[PDB]
Design a protein around this nucleic acid. Structure first.
Ligand code: MG
Ligand code: ZN
Lengths: 63, 83, 21, 709, 226, 573, 48, 237
RNA sequence: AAGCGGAGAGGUA
């Protein structure tokens, strides 16, 4: 209901959501921009956001 | 080597940096995570040592840690595991 | 013309105007 | 801005207002030129924004009926001979008869030279008819154009778009310090200055008795003596300068209607909005790529294009409840090095050079003594100049000030302003650009005798925009500058059969006139280019085609092909880069939302709208967008932590939650809706702040106040 | 075949300001580069003297008027900016200009101290009537190039001082023309004619000497490579 | 690179300057450093130059119609108050220099700097992500310079002569340096055909096959070429191992060269080569002698004769109407059809009269700007004009803009010159609303995995045959089948397999398929993807902006909407 | 209703591509199928 | 007067026959008064020697081919024009080249007369594989610059002489650029870059030094007019 | 240590 309410016809969608008692799961681009966390695209997906970086053992020992 | 020496930002070239990763979205996180380790090594050097090491390559006079991380990546000195 | 001290500015015009602005 | 814009603000017809149209819901048929506008409304001059077609300018000869309809004069023709009776007609009558064309070949007796003539029929359709049933004729050409448009030479060679652009740009020129008259122009400059009202015109004939820089005293012929006072360096509505200078001597004799003093943009009674500059048309090293302009450094040294801009500041002396605010020179605990100019009353003195941050008038406020705080008027950022005059209004001298205030101070600051990169220049034919580079004199292309050019224009924009009046103006300007003399030893040449007398010879720096729709034909220009007086030596710089041989200022080798050279009329528009540069790192924040303020008067941020967010999401950059939308804009706890991290050199912390989301939740709750933020297992999150560290680290204001010591 | 002649410089005088210098013989390709180097040096870096600021008696700033004078102060500045002066001392020098009563004030009424001369004694400055009086103090210095107005606050001067712009260059117009001999048998040379005209403050012979001095001293840093 | 004013750069980088000032003992506390910075004390400019090194900034201009409206640049200090922009990035921003303004933003954290340096750098984005055309290309002055430089004119100075009987060939040179020395003296022209011995430039394919055969180790192998000096100068800008071109550089040829370099070479040599092309074009544009004057605007030799001849037919039609034979509409259509031929006759007479070296002809023949309708209007006749309701007026405009229109001709000319302006301002709102709806409908399409391993696919015609027996390429095949992945093996005459499953369809695969007598192909398209949420990398195809397969996690539903809705302000009814 | 969905996507792609292609703008067909894919995702229910 | 910032000269050695020089920092606009004049002086002022005329026996009427060798006259002339020769005698000198039998004939066997030296003996001139004899005579003079062919200066004496173009200057290519730099607040100073490639007779440092000695005595003619003229003084080194 | 919200009009790309 967040994105549909922020696109067009706010009052109708808000009354429908209030009557139906809907729930928003916050897995879109617009909702994540609104609430203020990383959008699920590009460098924000779990694959690229959980990289662990450590120096190689050879360089660590040599230096 | 079909090019002349790059200047400033464009060194090292990404055509050689992208052979160490699978996509251009992993290079960003790679270098950004290395830069923070370098910086927080530098800031806590005065007191007791930590479990962070670096730089592993000869730093210049005044180089931003991001450039040091890029030069380390291009020289094949760091290894990363993709989530 | 019609101005007592206007500077002289010669014109290329070929027509004659019967009415003034 | 100048007299022309004032004369054109009146004589303006607006379609909008109470009882009319709407700006957005106008349409596309009310923004069209109707065939009944010939002589009553100008089809060229109109805004080019979203008001196109909804504002217009009244024509030159038109007048308004008592009922409210617009009339035009037509010259009546009877039995094939054009008489001299003038009758005013409205569109109703005009669409009933047959009206001829303005420039028909009358044979000095009233009968047309050619039987076929172009006429306008009842429905507004044009057609070719034999010269037997016509019964009216136009009084003159230029009767269908407005007053701003009738000042463009060679208008019939320019397309509608560029003519519209030039007519609209003629009203933005600023008044310069010298303001010399154009070399080639139309005859409408003289009447556009007297009628605007910017010049002093003698009311009665007489002999001038005394002349000075402030007043002129005229002794009439019946013993009456009249003295005219003059306005010196007065601020206009848009910050420019209005000046008046006498142009008469102490023993000359004047006549009723003669111009006595000049004005802002007036030279000897004629409108003068620009300067004459030497122009070469050629590409040059890419510095004039895409409508940029290259200038010389002589226009800066010799103040060719320089203007005076005046600004005004003001303050109020209020009666606060806890006391009464007063103007004085006892600012709380401030070093006397800053109170050097403020004499004794707390008001700066005349002639002092101010800068950003300095004090103009010193005032104090009662906190509710040991309650005096400092709230004084200070020069805002980006200003300077010399104080010109202070006007003080007091309550104890019968001056009527609003209740609550008791002392008004008005301080005027003026500064001169040179030309620089980013300042906008334009001509009368629609050319417009910004200055890309200012070159030294020693490395500009120069003629055979060593005279450098003053401005270089590109050649790739002239053909595809269809405004070739500028090259013709260039040729005629060079011919008028160097003079000419037709060799009439054996009669008169064939091409000069129609040229009047007194136009076969001209001395250097002559001034010529080319009316808007009947002027110098191309054959006459081609003939005049071939007979031009030489310079001080027996040389001719420009050959018969209008081209010259130029050298190069940097390498010295001559250019391989000749280049077009001439004199062009260039005016300086009122879009200066000194008023368009802005930057901000931390400043005042709003109140309902904690987002940065907007605007340039107060330190304001730049809006980052929807389309920029779409671009950032397309690029895939997820951290840049989050950092732009949380810590740089709204996160109230994140800003100070980021500033401390940057100053100390540590890493940037994590963001929080923007305050606009909480404001939205409050509004939704206040609309009788039950909005909740849940966790992974119910147990709705409180979302009600927490105990943070209130100790203000770094002991520095974040930036809302610049710095007070 | 290699030519043995060496180029020579000759002078021809047309007026007290215009002069022509002939240089020959030159290599086939010289003539434009040498002439343009001389022209670039002449028009940019030659020392001269000029006024830097003025002071009038009853005037605080530039945007005002003086009673009895037909022009305001800014027009007086614009008239004074065309003055031709020639100083010798290595310090600022002060000149005075006083006039009372009706008439016309020109540059001939300025009394210069020992070491300052005015070369333009008939230029119009202002015009006065029965109740007008003019008192001006001028400051002259030496320099090179072009220096804009130095702000008043940067020197600690009084509130009545009016900084002004200054042009130090005494050279007015320079040009050149090459004549090339392209006969057969491979005996080719060029001759250069350089035409200079100054501003009556310096002789056209004494500007070319300064240009040559600057150019030779600047080109001499390549020679020391041995 | 970009150029930033000193004052703006000092206001943007205030905290970094403060920390560096406190670091170098120039200030005691941060308050002292804050005062020093805010009063512009003469000790901050030395540290301000070394604090902006390798710190990118973002440049933006509104409207941001597509992705390339925001780009990252490396700043450098300049003197003035205006931002200096590279000439080649003005096509992407869609910005001329008649009064435009731009906005500057600053990245702070490490991730933001890394993204601005790697993802959004200006020299990493050259191809347009809608069709694949390069955008950083020479245009306007540069194409004119490059067209003048490499043009061959017969009978020029120092031309090659096959002289015989008493003297040698007289005009062969032993190296480009000798040719340059000869041109500097005036013996030789830069546009005259000569024979020159080249050593450091690779020969064309045919010459390499003929002379060396197996491989030409061009670093030291010498060959002889018949060309001009301008073509050698132009070829010295292309990379080392690139064959000699030896052709006149129209706009199309340069576009082909740029896309070939983008296809076969890494991404840094292209951004290095485009700069040298820009430099050469700018240098040779000023000495090409392109100038405008009234004597260069020629006129048709016989326009009065043609106009008088075509007036007679209109007279006959009008008289036939006046005798009652025709009604109004037939008369009007007859008149308009009569007057539509005189325009073409005048156009042809004008075109067959201009010499090929005119400034007005070489501007449009090199693809720089303009069409021939504009120059026919400028030098010939305007033609027919339109009524405000939209219909033609039977009376033409017989005068051009070089001779000057009369009064009512100029009045009726403005009827259609204001409707276009009034429709331009009304088209933008509709374009913007359409783009907003397109973006807000497609926002859950993101490439999620690498292969859904489906077998459904779309069918592509891929050229059509002729009854004669010759395959004819489909007119629109670049944007129908290029940058796609094959779905089934492409066989021929029940034989072997030419292109196997799961292979990108570039030019070589397409031409090898076409030279086998097979038209229909089956491809994998996003319409038939079997993955649950989003799409997959294989089904989508190749990214049009980088020339490779699409990466996992890219927001591919927004670039499509932006590319569809960006060229919407040039769609006339 | 008559020819199944494949013919409707062919129709939409071609008919929308023609309007752009008339005036000379190049847009690959993979950008238009991403939108038409979103117009055919839901079904209507006749009986439950 | 003084400049308060003395220009300096530095060198980069790319190759034994190619160098790059830098001048920095110069006043605004002084990068163009130096560069073009220096380039032209380097190109057409250094003295040197080169081949001016050749004669081949058996080639009198037509110039298309020569019996015995695998090439034509144009190839022989092009290979001869790329010879580096140092001469000391002012008058023209004559050289001979005689080779017999199969094998390649190079610049090693030109057998130079005392006073003339060849600096690249191993340069391919021709190859004989048809049991023929080669006897070519050459005339060598000295001068400066690039001089096109001289059209039969002595017509009545020689019938078989083939004039060739002469490349006297030891320097082959020179290019220059000028960039901007920063001294204190101003960011408008000049920086001159000169890239020079020369032949095997001379070193680039020597050419640059010999182009700075023929310019001091070129601008000394203008200084001789007035000994004291208040120019611009750099000062000591 | 202390404020900054609405309505209307004109312009720039
Ligand atoms: Mg623009
Ligand atoms: Zn798939």
């Amino acid at each position: 209901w967040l994105s549909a309410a922020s696109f067009q016809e706010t009052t109708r969608v808000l009354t429908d959501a209030a009557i139906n008692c809907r729930s928003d799961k916050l897995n879109g681009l617009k909702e994540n921009v609104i609430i203020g966390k990383l959008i699920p695209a590009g460098t924000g997906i779990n694959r690229y956001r959980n990289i662990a970086v450590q120096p190689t053992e050879e360089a660590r020992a040599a230096a | 080597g079909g090019y002349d020496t790059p200047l400033g930002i464009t060194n090292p070239p990404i055509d050689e940096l992208l052979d160490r990763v699978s996509s251009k979205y992993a290079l960003v996180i790679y270098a950004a995570k290395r830069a923070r380790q370098i910086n927080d090594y530098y800031n806590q050097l005065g007191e007791g040592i930590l479990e962070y090491v670096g730089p592993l390559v000869e730093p210049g006079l005044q180089e931003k840690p991001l450039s040091i991380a890029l030069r380390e990546i291009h020289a094949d000195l760091l290894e990363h595991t993709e989530g | 013309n019609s101005v007592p001290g206007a500077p002289n500015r010669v014109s290329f015009a070929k027509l004659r105007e019967p009415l003034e602005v | 801005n100048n007299p022309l814009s004032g004369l054109t603000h009146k004589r303006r017809l607006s379609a909008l207002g109470p009882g009319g149209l709407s700006r957005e819901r106008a349409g596309l048929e009310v923004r069209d030129v109707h065939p009944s506008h010939y002589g009553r409304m100008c089809p060229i001059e109109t805004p080019e924004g979203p008001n196109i077609g909804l504002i217009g300018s009244l024509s030159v000869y038109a007048r308004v009926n008592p009922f409210g309809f617009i009339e035009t004069p037509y010259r009546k023709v009877v039995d094939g001979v054009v008489s001299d009776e003038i009758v005013y007609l409205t569109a109703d009558e005009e669409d009933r008869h047959v009206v001829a064309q303005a420039n028909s070949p009358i044979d000095a007796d009233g009968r047309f030279v050619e039987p076929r003539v172009l006429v306008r029929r009842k429905a507004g359709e044009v057609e070719y008819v034999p010269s037997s049933e016509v019964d009216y004729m136009d009084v003159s050409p230029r009767q269908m154009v407005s007053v701003a448009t009738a000042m463009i030479p060679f208008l019939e060679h320019d397309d509608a778009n560029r003519a519209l652009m030039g007519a609209n740009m003629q009203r933005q020129a600023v008044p310069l310090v010298r303001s010399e008259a154009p070399l080639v122009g139309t005859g409408m400059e003289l009447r556009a200055a007297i009628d605007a009202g910017d010049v002093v015109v003698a009311e009665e004939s007489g002999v001038i008795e005394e002349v000075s820089a402030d007043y002129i005293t005229v002794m009439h012929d019946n013993g009456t003596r009249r003295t005219y006072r003059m306005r010196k360096f007065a601020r206009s509505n848009h910050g420019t300068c209005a000046n008046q200078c006498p142009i008469v001597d102490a023993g000359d004799r004047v006549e009723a209607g003669q111009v006595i003093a000049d004005g802002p943009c007036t030279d000897d009674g004629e409108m003068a909005l620009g300067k004459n500059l030497l122009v070469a048309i050629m590409p040059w090293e890419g510095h004039n790529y895409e409508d940029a302009i290259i200038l010389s450094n002589r226009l800066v040294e010799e103040d060719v294009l320089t203007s005076i801009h005046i600004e005004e500041h003001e303050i109020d002396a209020r009666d606060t409840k806890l006391g009464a605010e007063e103007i004085t020179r006892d600012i709380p605990n401030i070093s006397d090095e800053v109170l050097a100019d403020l004499d004794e009353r707390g008001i700066v003195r005349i002639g002092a050079e101010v800068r950003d941050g300095d004090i103009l008038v010193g005032k104090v406020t009662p906190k509710g003594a040991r309650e005096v705080r400092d709230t004084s008027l200070k020069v805002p950022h980006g200003e300077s100049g010399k104080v010109i005059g202070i006007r003080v209004f007091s309550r104890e001298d019968e001056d009527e000030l609003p209740a609550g205030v008791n002392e008004l101070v008005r301080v005027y600051v003026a500064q001169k302003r040179k030309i620089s990169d980013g300042d906008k220049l334009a001509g009368r034919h629609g050319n417009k650009g910004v200055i890309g580079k200012i070159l030294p004199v020693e490395d500009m292309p120069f003629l055979a005798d060593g005279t450098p050019v003053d401005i270089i224009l590109n050649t790739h924009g002239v053909p595809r925009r269809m405004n070739i009046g500028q090259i013709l103006e260039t040729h005629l300007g060079w011919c008028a500058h160097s003079g000419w003399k037709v060799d009439a030893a054996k009669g008169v040449p064939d091409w000069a059969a129609r040229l009047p007398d007194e136009l076969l010879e001209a001395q250097p720096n002559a001034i010529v006139s080319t009316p808007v729709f009947d002027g110098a034909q191309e054959a006459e220009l081609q003939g005049l280019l071939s007979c031009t007086l030489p310079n001080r030596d027996g040389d001719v710089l420009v050959d018969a085609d209008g081209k010259a041989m130029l050298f190069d200022g940097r390498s010295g080798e001559p250019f391989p092909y000749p280049v077009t050279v001439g004199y062009m009329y260039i005016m300086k528009l009122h879009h200066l880069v000194d008023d368009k540069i802005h930057a901000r790192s931390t400043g005042p924040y709003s109140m309902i939302t904690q987002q940065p303020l907007g605007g340039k008067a107060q330190f304001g941020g730049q809006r980052f709208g929807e389309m920029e967010c779409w671009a950032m999401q397309a690029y895939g950059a997820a951290y840049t967008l989050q950092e732009l939308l949380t810590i740089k804009s709204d996160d109230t706890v994140g800003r100070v932590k980021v500033y401390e991290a940057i100053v100390k050199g540590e890493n940037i912390p994590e963001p929080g939650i923007p305050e606009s989301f909480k404001v939205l939740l409050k509004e939704l709750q206040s609309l009788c809706l039950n909005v909740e933020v849940l966790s992974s297992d119910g147990a709705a999150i409180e979302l009600r702040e927490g105990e943070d560290e209130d100790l203000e680290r770094a002991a520095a204001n974040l930036g809302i106040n610049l710095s007070r010591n | 075949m290699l030519i043995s002649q060496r180029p020579t410089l000759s002078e021809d005088v047309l007026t007290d300001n215009r002069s022509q210098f002939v240089i020959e013989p030159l290599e086939p390709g010289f003539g434009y580069t040498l002439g343009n180097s001389l022209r670039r040096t002449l028009l940019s870096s030659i020392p001269g003297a000029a006024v830097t600021s003025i002071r009038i008696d009853g005037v605080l700033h530039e945007f005002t008027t003086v009673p009895g004078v037909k022009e305001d102060v800014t027009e007086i500045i614009l008239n004074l900016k065309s003055l031709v002066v020639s100083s010798e001392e290595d310090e600022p020098v002060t000149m005075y200009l006083r006039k009372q009563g009706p008439g016309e004030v020109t540059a001939g009424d300025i009394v210069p101290p020992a070491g300052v001369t005015v070369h333009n004694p008939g230029m119009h400055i202002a015009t006065l009537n029965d109740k007008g009086k003019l008192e001006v103090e001028l400051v002259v210095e030496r320099g090179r190039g072009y220096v804009p107005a130095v702000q008043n606050r940067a020197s600690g001067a009084e509130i009545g001082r009016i900084p002004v712009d200054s042009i130090y260059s005494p050279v007015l117009k320079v040009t050149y023309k090459v004549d090339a001999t392209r006969v057969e048998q491979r005996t080719d040379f060029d001759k250069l004619i350089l035409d200079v005209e100054t501003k009556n403050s310096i002789s056209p012979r004494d500007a070319l000497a300064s240009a040559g001095k600057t150019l030779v001293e600047l080109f001499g840093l390549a020679r020391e490579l041995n | 690179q970009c150029g930033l004013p000193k004052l703006m750069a000092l206001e943007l980088f205030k905290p970094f300057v403060m920390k560096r000032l406190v670091d170098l003992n120039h200030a005691q506390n941060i308050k002292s450093a804050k005062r020093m910075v805010e009063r512009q004390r003469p000790q901050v400019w030395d540290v301000l130059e070394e604090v902006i090194a390798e710190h990118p900034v973002l440049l933006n201009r509104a409207p941001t119609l597509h992705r390339l409206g925001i780009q990252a640049f490396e700043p450098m200090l300049v003197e003035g108050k205006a931002i200096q922009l590279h000439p080649l990035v003005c096509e992407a921003f869609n910005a001329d220099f008649d009064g435009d303004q731009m906005a500057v933003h600053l990245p702070l954290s490490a991730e933001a700097q890394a993204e601005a340096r790697i993802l959004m750098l200006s020299s990493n984005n050259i191809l347009s992500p809608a069709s694949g055309r390069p955008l950083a290309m020479p245009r306007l002055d540069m194409v004119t310079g490059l067209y003048y430089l490499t043009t061959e004119v017969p009978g020029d100075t120092g031309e090659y002569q096959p002289a015989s009987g008493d003297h040698p060939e007289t005009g062969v040179y032993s190296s480009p340096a000798e040719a340059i020395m000869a041109a500097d003296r005036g013996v030789l022209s830069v546009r005259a055909k000569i024979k020159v011995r080249l050593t450091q430039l690779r020969p064309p394919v045919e010459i390499e096959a003929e002379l060396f055969g197996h491989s030409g180790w061009q670093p030291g192998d010498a060959w002889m070429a018949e060309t001009t000096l301008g073509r050698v100068m132009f070829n010295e800008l292309l990379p080392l191992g690139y064959p000699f071109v030896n052709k006149q550089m129209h706009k199309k040829v340069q576009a082909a060269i740029i896309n070939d370099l983008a296809e076969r070479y890494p991404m840094i040599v292209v951004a290095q080569t485009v700069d040298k092309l820009k430099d050469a074009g700018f240098y040779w544009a000023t000495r090409s002698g392109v100038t405008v004057s009234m004597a260069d605007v020629l006129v048709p030799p016989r326009k009065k004769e043609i106009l008088d001849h075509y007036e007679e037919r209109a007279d006959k039609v009008e008289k036939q109407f006046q005798r009652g034979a025709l009604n109004h509409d037939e008369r009007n259509e007859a008149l308009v059809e009569i007057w539509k031929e005189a325009t073409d006759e005048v156009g042809q007479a004008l075109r067959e009269h201009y010499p090929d070296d005119n400034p007005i002809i070489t501007i449009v023949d090199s693809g720089a700007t303009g069409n021939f309708t504009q120059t026919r209007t400028l030098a010939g006749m305007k033609g027919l004009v339109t009524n405000p309701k939209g219909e033609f007026i039977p009376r033409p405009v017989k005068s051009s803009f070089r001779e000057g229109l009369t009064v009512l001709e100029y009045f009726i000319n403005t009827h259609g010159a204001r409707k276009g302006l009034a429709d331009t301002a009304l088209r933008t709102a509709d374009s913007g609303y359409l783009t907003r709806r397109l973006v807000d409908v497609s926002q859950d399409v993101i490439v999620r995995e690498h292969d859904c391993q489906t077998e459904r696919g779309i069918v592509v015609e891929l050229a059509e045959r002729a009854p004669d027996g010759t395959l004819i390429r489909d007119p629109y095949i670049e944007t129908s089948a290029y940058a796609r992945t094959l779905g089934t093996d492409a066989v021929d005459e029940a034989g072997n397999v030419i292109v196997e499953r799961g292979q990108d369809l570039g030019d070589p695969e397409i031409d090898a398929l076409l030279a086998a007598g097979i038209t229909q192909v089956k491809v994998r398209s996003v319409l038939t993807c079997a993955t649950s949420t989003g799409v997959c990398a294989t089904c989508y195809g190749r990214s049009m902006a980088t020339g490779k397969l699409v990466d996992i996690g890219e927001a591919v539903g927004i670039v499509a909407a932006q590319s569809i809705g960006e060229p919407g302000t040039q769609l006339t009814m | 209703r008559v020819q199944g969905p494949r013919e409707v996507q062919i129709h939409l792609v071609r008919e929308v591509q023609e309007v752009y292609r008339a005036q000379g703008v190049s847009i690959h067909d993979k950008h238009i199928e991403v939108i038409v894919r979103q117009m055919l995702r839901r079904v209507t229910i006749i009986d439950s």
